[PDB]
Design a protein around this ligand. Structure first.
Ligand SMILES: CCN1CCN(C(=O)N[C@@H](C(=O)N[C@H](C=O)[C@@H]2N[C@@H](C(=O)O)C(C)(C)S2)c2ccccc2)C(=O)C1=O
Length: 517
């Protein structure tokens, strides 16, 4: 019986889709590689050639021979996967009986570490396993072909009969990322980390009008063309996977809920004296504690937790929750990246006072940098939230009006004062332009359950520009800066400034800090 001849089929590997940036610059490119395999049965008839073959494969001669001897019953084994076709011709030129070639693909990432987290990485079988390569793996993968052959009883192909199914190439994908901005962000976030002795950071830039992520960088990063180091922490796309309490950066949302309530206008006053406010066993405290009456703008400039808490008590937590929820804090982004973290927005039927206050000033909720950026985008886009995209958006979908345009425009103006006013976040200023935003500084949560860390902080800045017709929103998060100056306004705001200055000019956005006509 057995099988004198035997009809078998083999997979024809499909070319993986090119990934570009939004201008067509290549970011992931399928590279023809040569994979060498062998038929041990056929090898058994040319043992005299093995030691030269082992040498060519950088293998110990005995270990190589042991490997073939032990796999002698098999008909297929890899010798080496993915060599350059030039390396592959070297071994093919030995002309060893039983040694054969297949054309595979392997990705090359021309921008390397600069866009590694966003673009991602493929596994040994050319499948996506992080970032866009994973999120769009079915678009990018195409469909393998099917080639029909005849094989003898000891595994040797006797002829190519025909292609029963043609391989179908995967399709091109243009990201929303602009590599010019991505490089600028990458460089300035790296510099800031190093300058501050920080442990990690993220920086997201978004188009407020289109929902597009124009830049997304994290430190530490890695070189996805280096398939050896296997360093899982440097591979974390922190902007999408590492949640944090946003702190004072959510106060503009609390204020939006205050203005929409009917009960508050920007010139109304809150008494924040003496810088603390006792709520049962918890004490709300401000960092700076030499104020009494502050107007709502001043509450933001001084970043008074006490002031925002008194407003929260007056309007109720439900209104604040609703704004936060509607702008996307702790909510699914829709981006469909496996392993993206949603974080958490807490909810109550009856909010207690402490939960009410801490929510209003940014504790007891966990967000991602992408969420935070999208929320600022909505605010900047006169209160309209356009769906987030990591792919280039040619036709913009309808956004959802999540904050009224009048309230969002009032809040814009207040954030411009936060940047421009005396005692504000002057380091976030963008020469030539009107910029707007909000600093934060949060103690990190302690890892052994419990409470909060004494000496360890996260520094934040979130903002947009130009104030008079916003185009770009940005979030800068730096984890555990190490110098005496650790506040968001010191550490993160100058990154915002430098990156907004370049980004606006790369986008040919006209300077708006002009005379009055
Ligand atoms: C829920 C308990 N729990 C947890 C942690 N926690 C907290 O980490 N507090 C920080 C805070 O108050 N941050 C505010 C908004 O971020 C203000 N804005 C900063 C900014 O603008 O950079 C600021 C000007 C430095 S103070 C803080 C404290 C100390 C130093 C710096 C910042 C609380 O307060 C708090 O009760």
């Amino acid at each position: 019986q057995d099988p004198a001849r035997s009809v078998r089929h083999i997979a024809i590997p499909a070319h993986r889709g090119l990934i570009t940036d939004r201008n067509g610059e290549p970011l992931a490119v399928s590279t023809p590689v040569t994979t060498l395999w062998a038929n041990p049965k056929e090898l058994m008839t040319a043992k005299e050639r093995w030691p030269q073959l082992a040498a060519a494969l950088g293998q110990d001669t005995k270990l190589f021979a042991d490997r073939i001897e032990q796999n002698a019953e098999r008909e297929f084994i890899y010798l080496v996967r993915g060599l350059t076709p030039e390396q592959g011709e070297g071994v093919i030129a030995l002309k060893v009986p039983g040694v054969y070639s297949i054309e595979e693909f392997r990705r090359f990432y021309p921008a390397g570490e600069v866009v590694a987290h966003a673009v991602g990485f493929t596994d040994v079988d050319d499948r996506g396993r992080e970032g866009i390569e994973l999120a769009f793996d079915e678009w990018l993968a195409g469909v393998p072909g099917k080639r029909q052959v005849l094989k003898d009883r000891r595994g040797r192909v006797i002829k190519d009969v025909q292609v029963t199914k043609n391989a179908k190439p995967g399709k091109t994908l243009a990201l929303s990322i602009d590599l010019r901005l991505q490089y600028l962000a990458h460089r300035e976030l790296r510099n800031a980390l190093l300058e501050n002795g920080a442990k990690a950071g993220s920086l997201v830039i978004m188009d407020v009008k289109t929902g597009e992520i124009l830049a997304m960088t994290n430190q530490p990063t890695y070189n996805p063309n280096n398939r050896r180091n296997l360093q899982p922490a440097a591979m974390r796309n922190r902007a999408m996977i590492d949640v944090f309490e946003p702190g004072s950066t959510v106060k503009p949302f609390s204020m939006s809920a205050a203005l929409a309530s009917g009960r508050w206008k920007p010139s109304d006053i809150v008494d924040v004296y003496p810088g603390t406010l006792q709520i049962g066993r918890y004490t709300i405290r401000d960092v700076s504690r030499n104020s009494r009456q502050l107007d709502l703008t001043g509450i933001l400039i001084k970043s008074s937790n006490v002031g925002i808490s008194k407003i929260a008590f007056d309007i109720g937590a439900e209104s604040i929750y609703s704004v936060m929820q509607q702008v996307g804090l702790g909510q699914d982004t829709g981006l469909g990246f496996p392993g993206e973290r949603v974080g958490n927005l807490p909810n109550h039927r009856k909010w207690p006072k402490a939960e009410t206050a801490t929510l209003a000033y940014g504790y007891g909720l966990s967000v991602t940098a992408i969420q935070l950026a999208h929320a600022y985008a909505a605010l900047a886009n006169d209160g309209k939230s356009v769906p987030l995209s990591m792919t280039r958006v040619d036709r913009v979908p309808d956004g959802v009006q999540v904050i009224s345009p009048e309230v969002a425009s009032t809040v814009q103006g207040m954030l411009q004062q936060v940047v421009e006013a005396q005692g504000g976040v002057f380091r976030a200023q963008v020469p030539g332009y009107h910029a707007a935003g909000k600093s934060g500084t949060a103690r990190k949560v302690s890892v052994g359950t419990k409470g909060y860390r004494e000496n360890a902080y996260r520094s934040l800045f979130a903002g947009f520009a130009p104030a008079t017709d916003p185009r770009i929103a940005m979030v800068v998060v730096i984890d555990e800066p190490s110098k005496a100056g650790y506040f968001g306004g010191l550490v993160s705001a100058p990154v915002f400034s430098k990156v907004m200055a370049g980004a606006l000019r790369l986008m040919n956005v006209p300077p708006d800090n002009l005379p009055t006509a």
